[PDB]
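Sample 1 of the test manifest.
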Amino acid sequence: AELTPEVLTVPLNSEGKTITLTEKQYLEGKRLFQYACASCHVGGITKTNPSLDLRTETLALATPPRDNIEGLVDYMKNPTTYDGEQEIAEVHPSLRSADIFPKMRNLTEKDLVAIAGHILVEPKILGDKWGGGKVYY
Amino acid sequence: NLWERFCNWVTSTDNRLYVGWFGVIMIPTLLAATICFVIAFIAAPPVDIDGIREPVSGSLLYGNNIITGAVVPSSNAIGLHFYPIWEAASLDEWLYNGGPYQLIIFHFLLGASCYMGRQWELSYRLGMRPWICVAYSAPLASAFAVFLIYPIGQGSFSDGMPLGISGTFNFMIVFQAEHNILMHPFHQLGVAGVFGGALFCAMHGSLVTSSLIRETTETESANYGYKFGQEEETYNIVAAHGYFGRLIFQYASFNNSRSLHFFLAAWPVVGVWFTALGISTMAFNLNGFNFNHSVIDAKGNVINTWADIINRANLGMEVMHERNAHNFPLDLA
Amino acid sequence: MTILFQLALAALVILSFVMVIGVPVAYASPQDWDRSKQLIFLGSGLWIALVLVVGVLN
Amino acid sequence: WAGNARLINLSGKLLGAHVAHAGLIVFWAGAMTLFELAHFIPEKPMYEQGLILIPHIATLGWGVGPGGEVVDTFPFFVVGVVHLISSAVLGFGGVYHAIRGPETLEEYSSFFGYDWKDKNKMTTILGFHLIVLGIGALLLVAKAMFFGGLYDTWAPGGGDVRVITNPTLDPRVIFGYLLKSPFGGEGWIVSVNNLEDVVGGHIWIGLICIAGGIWHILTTPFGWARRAFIWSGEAYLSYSLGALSMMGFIATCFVWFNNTVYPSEFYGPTGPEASQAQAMTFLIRDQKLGANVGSAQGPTGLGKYLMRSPTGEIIFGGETMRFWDFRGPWLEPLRGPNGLDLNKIKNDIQPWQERRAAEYMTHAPLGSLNSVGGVATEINSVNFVSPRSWLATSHFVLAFFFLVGHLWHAGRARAAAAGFE
Amino acid sequence: WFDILDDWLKRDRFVFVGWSGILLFPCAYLALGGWLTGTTFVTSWYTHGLASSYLEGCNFLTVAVSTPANSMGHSLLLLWGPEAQGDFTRWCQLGGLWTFIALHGAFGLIGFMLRQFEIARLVGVRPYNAIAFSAPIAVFVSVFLIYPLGQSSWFFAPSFGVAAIFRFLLFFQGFHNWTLNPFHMMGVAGVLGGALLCAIHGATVENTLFQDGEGASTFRAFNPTQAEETYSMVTANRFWSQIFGIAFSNKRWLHFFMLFVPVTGLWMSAIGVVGLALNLRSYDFISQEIRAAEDPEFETFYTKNLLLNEGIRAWMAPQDQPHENFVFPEEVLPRGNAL
Amino acid sequence: METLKITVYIVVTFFVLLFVFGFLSGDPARNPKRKDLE
Amino acid sequence: KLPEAYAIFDPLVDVLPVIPVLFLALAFVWQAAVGFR
Amino acid sequence: SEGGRIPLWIVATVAGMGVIVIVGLFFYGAYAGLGSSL
Ligand code: CLA
Ligand code: CLA
Ligand code: CLA
Ligand code: CLA
Ligand code: CLA
Ligand code: CLA
Ligand SMILES: C=Cc1c(C)c2cc3nc(c4c5[nH]c(cc6nc(cc1[nH]2)C(C)=C6CC)c(C)c5C(=O)[C@@H]4C(=O)OC)[C@@H](CCC(=O)OC/C=C(\C)CCC[C@H](C)CCC[C@H](C)CCCC(C)C)[C@@H]3C
Ligand SMILES: CC1=C(/C=C/C(C)=C/C=C/C(C)=C/C=C/C=C(C)/C=C/C=C(C)/C=C/C2=C(C)CCCC2(C)C)C(C)(C)CCC1
Ligand SMILES: CC1=C(/C=C/C(C)=C/C=C/C(C)=C/C=C/C=C(C)/C=C/C=C(C)/C=C/C2=C(C)CCCC2(C)C)C(C)(C)CCC1
Ligand SMILES: CC1=C(/C=C/C(C)=C/C=C/C(C)=C/C=C/C=C(C)/C=C/C=C(C)/C=C/C2=C(C)CCCC2(C)C)C(C)(C)CCC1
Ligand code: OEC
Ligand SMILES: [Fe+3]
């Protein structure tokens, strides 16, 4: 019933290779999420745009695909509308918009990866809840 | 010359009451509230609490029974503004936007405040101490807290606290669904102050009654009282202090009458002192505790703590309070 | 020199640690004030000086 | 253990105490400023951590660029230290004066420092302390006009520190604020919009303090004043006691509804800010979904986003209709005659505005003891509690108890005069 | 050999152990330990699904001793109960504690009123206190026995904890609208009246105390001969009479009336609960409901409340009652627009 | 209704001057039962 | 943390600001040593 | 007043401060578990 490797054996890229995270990282994921996210993304639900969540399934239908890490990393650096036609850097946190989202200024590649990991491991634990807040709604 | 003859009147005993400088405002004020209020409850027309165009009518004539409700809060449009009569147009209007509410409230607080002053001032004309002024201060402060501070902290008198029995209940419910009070020490000490007073007002009067002067003109067919002229007073305090002391332990019992009656006025007053604060503190959003999650890092499986089933109820209610008056996802006030 | 500030400070530290404990006992009339009062203008003299050293060090 | 009441008449010891507690007030000033610049992290919303003085220090525009946290770190360390040492400078004083020996029998001294029941000397001592406020007040003025500015949150762009010129010194304007309805958005002192009013509003105080300090110095109270007030020592506390209470309230309410004085940038967003911020945040969101904002019809028939105010202007609809009195730098440019311009709305809306809406809307003053952020129902993964709710909350409390104090000590001055003592 | 024990036993020491002293202490001790033991060491999620103790990390408030599982009805599962089969650990897993605490604890209450009778016939005082004490005992049985009896089982009885009690409150508001019951209203009357008395009495005294009784002017003295006591009824009287308008001045009445208010109240409240035990409630106003359905432009606070309730019931009953296994699809749940 | 607003204020302030001038009062001042200092 | 060179003292600085409260504490001990009067 | 007398204002301070350390813990401890809440 403990946290297992499989649990952390998350998809890394579109094709089919995977990486298995560690204990140390996982935790940094939360700590970071809470740091520049939670406020707007509490429990994995957009407060500013409720019709768009962070559940795994909804991320795969994005453009470009986002059910894996490389995609999220790309997003955190530069943003992409659910379809991929607008540059929302002047609106959403982005390493490219540090100057406006000071919380981002400090961040590093290692941290993005972990943050991404937190978002992909959570659902395996929380299930429906992390989605639209079941226990929470 | 006349001016002197008037003051003397106001200042001493008038064979009915004492109406000092404080009751010079208290008497005409609390009257306007009474009258207005009695009539508002017997005929006021519906009033739309939240600006929405859905009037609620909690008056006798408009289909209510006593518990069903009364004088409803001002509109949420006029919500925080000053809504006098002159300031509006026809009374048909006024009556719809909750006028009676403000009018009644404000006069009542002011005169409520003065009813307190009056209490002290009588002390000054009778050479006694100034304490009763202080013990009243607890509820008064509380009324203000509920009728003022909150609507002042929240942004509109609407949802102050309805002047009906039923709405009292509503205010309560909505309230803990919005700020979660149950789990706030100030309302916890509140229940302490009150359940306190109950346990003590029963304890005292109970003992005071058990240790009476068993032999003073009391037979089995008659029971007649004491009067100040009565020296030894009614009871044998040694019997009571002996009783209580033997029920738990020596310290537990109270030696003298000061520590006894001081306790009786200390527990309740300082309990509500806090509660009245409780509300005033949650008037500016410093809501009670909320231990929503305890986990099993094993997998992170969330374990529900008794408190979550409390949030499960607090939840259902949030969802439906002020149905259809919300256009955006999260309430912020 | 990082060493001077690490000592000037720890210097003003220990002085205060003492001062705050001594100054009060010193006002215990039946324990000679002659001896105790000397040390006083000393901690005070010494202190306000340290206060200015640290400052000037930046 | 009324210990502090045994001290009543031996003014030689009160000085020892008043100057002892006067040492704590300053001690806290350092212990907290240093504790803050300690935990303090640069570029993270001052208020999302849990600070209170620094925000004050940046208010005076001591160390900041256009609404930019802090470019210069240092300015705070100065404050942290100074006050922490002023605490010893006085700890010494309070202690000494408390323990080394009483007062009132020093002949040359009694000429410089007298006692109670002596209207002419109490008056004189009073004026004195009045000449001091007259100054401190005027110093604030100095720090805005000929010194390193003050933080103006208004026009334009970012409102960094700016130096003021010719403060609103009109005789009328200043007391007008005193003569205005303390209701619906308009609180006499709180209504203060323009930072220049605030400067000029301080100049007049000092002149008034000083012109008064000296006044009582030279004059002893008239008859009417003598037959209204008592003169016991306890009674002067009752006066001063209740004065502070009112103010506790004063400032509290003053805290919740910001005037440029409390730039929401450090302190956070105003209770209404959040709501109004949430309305605006969504006009845009749907505007981006091509929604027409003028014809919107909410389940009530009031239009989701736009409706009117009793005096007939346009305001964000929804419960946030009760905060149309709200005014800030972000929401204003859309303001114009008749209310909000439906044409600047859908045409001239810059992006940096959505940001502020979202941020504020996101950090709603709403919080609990567990520092849980947001609605009473949220999950514990977000920590926050708007400084304002902290200041408003704690400070309300004191203004209350303190009033209880106005009653207790003033009612006991009626027992001295003849009652129970 | 008897009378001796009477005396040895009834011997006036520090802590009076009377004849009743045998029931009281063994029971009032175990009823306390029972709580504190589980509170600190037991989990009740095999029986309730939640976290019971500190062992799992609840705060004091959260921690409690949870009620048995609804599948068991009213079987007192004592250690040797056919169900626990003597295995302690499980006897705890199943909640065999609740029963423990309520039973032993019921007798501790029995002992405490008995000990209140003893002391009155040794000292020669009136039994009144022992009688005032019935109210709480009523409230207790009413609550923790009568109610669970009437319903499906032990589960629905209050849970022994802090929060676990608040949840009780709310439960009642949703399914019973207990606040509308008149009985709880009167109960609500005495409790608030008990505190109103406690203030006026205590403040009046303290403030009408005799002048100069102490030169130093503080008030820490008395004596037996201080027959008259430290204060005036004559002045209080006039004080009240002129401020409030009324004031029965006869000390003996004042104190008794102080017995009537609190106690008279709790008896009602307890009655009110014997009613709910049988899902017999004051949750409706036929008159209103009727006009509430034939007409949609008519609403009163009576109504607005009945709405909140259903919200309480829909959202809170599937997690709060694990045995029926409620499955409620998002859509289905009642829900105001936007929230 | 403007006629009403006016009428009120008169009434209100009227009873204010009676509070204020009732206290500053040189005549009744602060007269108690145990001691009169005049 | 921005104290730079003083780094060394986070500790004492951290438990620092509480002392104003502990002042209240001695006050009662002062009393205990003096039999409460 | 210590002629070598058996202490009490010490006992009163020993436990009093002792208790603060146990409770203090109880607060620390209240952090180790809710802290992984999500
Ligand atoms: C039957 C057992 C029972 C018990 C033991 C408790 C116990 C408690 N309840 Mg609960 N409650 C119960 C049943 C029970 N409740 C029921 C059936 C309901 C209805 C569902 C509730 C509803 C309820 C609510 C709604 C609340 C409580 C709260 C509380 C706490 C209140 C604190 C207080 O001030 O109380 C009043 C009592 C006193 C002030 C005095 C008790 C006597 C003390 C221990 C004496 C100390 C004296 C010392 C030893 C000697 C000094 C000697 C002197 C001479 C100097 C307390 C922990 C409140 C709370 O804060 O929750 C955390 C609260 O808000 N309860
Ligand atoms: C302007 C400031 C002020 C001053 C200088 C005084 C001065 C005095 N008061 Mg008054 N008082 C004040 C305000 C003030 N008071 C207020 C606002 C109230 C209303 C609450 C009172 C209520 C009051 C009462 C009811 C009494 C006095 C009395 C006295 C005399 C007391 C001597 C004594 O025994 O102290 C002893 C003091 C204490 C033991 C302090 C208790 C303080 C609380 C319990 C501490 C709470 C802190 C808490 C633990 C912190 C938690 C941490 C936080 C971070 C969350 C003294 C002349 C007494 C008297 O007889 O007057 C002549 C008296 O009976 N005062
Ligand atoms: C607000 C804070 C406060 C203050 C300032 C005072 C002040 C005072 N109290 Mg009161 N007291 C208070 C709270 C306070 N009390 C409370 C809450 C209670 C209830 C518990 C009491 C109960 C009380 C009683 C019962 C009595 C007093 C008495 C006194 C007087 C004692 C004078 C003396 O020489 O003592 C002796 C001094 C000492 C033992 C020394 C203490 C030394 C301090 C801690 C040193 C701090 C270090 C110093 C700053 C170092 C400087 C170094 C430099 C280089 C910078 C003094 C004016 C007494 C009295 O009769 O007064 C008329 C008395 O009997 N008080
Ligand atoms: C609230 C603000 C405040 C206020 C209003 C005061 C007010 C006062 N202070 Mg204080 N002070 C304060 C804060 C404050 N202080 C603080 C924060 C500190 C700590 C830094 C001090 C430290 C302090 C000290 C150290 C002294 C004062 C003194 C004085 C008094 C000076 C008046 C004067 O004319 O001295 C002018 C001085 C003189 C006329 C000195 C005459 C010298 C004596 C008589 C010599 C005795 C020796 C003799 C040879 C012995 C023969 C004995 C035989 C057996 C051999 C005055 C009442 C002085 C005082 O009380 O002493 C009189 C003093 O010495 N204050
Ligand atoms: C530190 C505060 C202070 C205090 C405690 C006093 C106290 C006193 N003053 Mg003094 N005064 C002060 C400051 C102060 N004054 C200043 C700054 C000035 C310069 C304008 C004066 C000018 C002054 C004069 C000209 C006279 C007094 C008089 C008196 C005595 C009047 C008796 C009385 O209160 O009657 C009853 C009081 C009232 C009817 C007034 C109630 C006023 C309310 C509470 C305050 C309103 C304040 C204002 C609106 C706020 C400013 C807001 C800002 C934004 C601009 C009393 C001892 C009289 C005297 O001593 O005679 C010889 C007198 O004739 N004072
Ligand atoms: C920081 C500045 C500030 C300050 C100090 C206040 C202060 C106050 N506000 Mg205001 N408020 C502010 C900003 C401020 N507000 C802002 C920005 C808004 C915008 C939303 C509001 C909105 C607001 C509302 C909606 C309400 C208040 C109310 C109050 C009062 C509550 C206490 C009370 O019950 O007094 C009772 C009265 C007194 C203690 C009288 C003090 C005056 C002298 C000393 C006595 C005169 C005596 C005589 C008997 C009474 C004559 C009064 C007259 C009106 C008839 C208090 C005076 C409440 C109120 O009662 O309105 C006035 C209220 O309902 N405020
Ligand atoms: C908050 C509610 C409340 C509490 C906690 C409370 C408590 C107490 N009242 C007593 C007495 C009284 N109370 C009285 C009237 C009242 N008491 C009231 C309300 C309360 N009274 C009210 C409203 C009244 C007015 C009717 C009277 C007239 C008396 C007394 O004569 C008596 C006294 O001497 O006064 C101080 C004491 C009896 C001790 C005893 O018999 O142990 C025996 C039994 C024990 C120890 C346990 C029985 C088992 C129960 C079921 C278990 C309780 C265990 C808890 C669940 C565990 C702890 C929980 C924590 C949250 C605290 C006890 C301190
Ligand atoms: C209780 C009481 C009282 C009181 C007391 C008081 C009032 C006190 C005070 C005190 C005080 C008022 C104090 C103060 C102190 C201070 C201090 C002790 C300080 C210190 C400092 C230091 C040490 C420094 C710091 C620093 C710096 C500056 C820089 C950087 C680094 C550092 C951090 C190092 C009396 C006697 C009346 C009586 C009895 C009781
Ligand atoms: C089960 C059982 C048993 C046993 C047991 C018992 C009887 C127990 C008990 C137990 C107990 C008996 C326990 C306890 C614990 C406790 C604790 C852990 C406590 C704590 C406390 C505290 C911490 C406190 C504090 C405080 C403060 C600080 C302040 C305010 C007030 C107060 C007082 C609250 C037997 C074998 C018989 C059989 C059957 C079963
Ligand atoms: C020098 C120095 C400093 C300072 C310090 C201070 C200022 C301190 C303080 C401290 C304090 C200020 C402390 C205190 C403590 C206290 C205590 C420890 C107390 C206790 C008490 C008790 C234990 C009591 C008891 C009791 C009684 C008597 C009665 C009633 C009940 C009771 C039991 C509660 C610093 C850090 C800056 C750094 C540098 C150096
Ligand atoms: Mn009367 O209410 Ca203060 O919560 Mn949200 O905002 Mn309007 O909805 Mn209910
Ligand atoms: Fe009594």
